[PDB]
Design a protein around this nucleic acid. Structure first.
Length: 81
RNA sequence: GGAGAGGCUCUGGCAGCUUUUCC
């Protein structure tokens, strides 16, 4: 259960974005990809990243749709980029 | 019997299992 995700310190630091999601075991599978683009991932992209669990991957797509939303609204800080 | 700290595993939770630590 996340509470923010739209946070520039988490968005710049993918491990700590994923800490707030209990997915920080897959932090190396989701690293090498910046937040701005990670969010645009697909279910197929996630299983090719290393996100083989169904629960995991579905919860990335959720987490992702939220941040994207705030990106498309511009409510995010310039320090996330 | 209870709590803390790692490792692992999805069904992704103050989840489960496991290894340790303290009582």
């Amino acid at each position: 259960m996340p509470k923010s995700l739209t946070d520039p310190k988490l968005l710049k630091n993918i491990p700590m974005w994923l800490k707030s999601l209990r997915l920080h075991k897959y932090s190396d599978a989701l690293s090498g990809t910046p937040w701005i683009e990670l969010i645009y991932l697909d279910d197929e992209t996630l299983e090719k990243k290393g996100v083989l669990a169904l629960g995991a991957r579905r919860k990335l797509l959720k987490a992702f749709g939220i941040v994207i939303d705030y990106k498309e609204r511009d409510l995010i800080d310039r320090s996330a980029y």
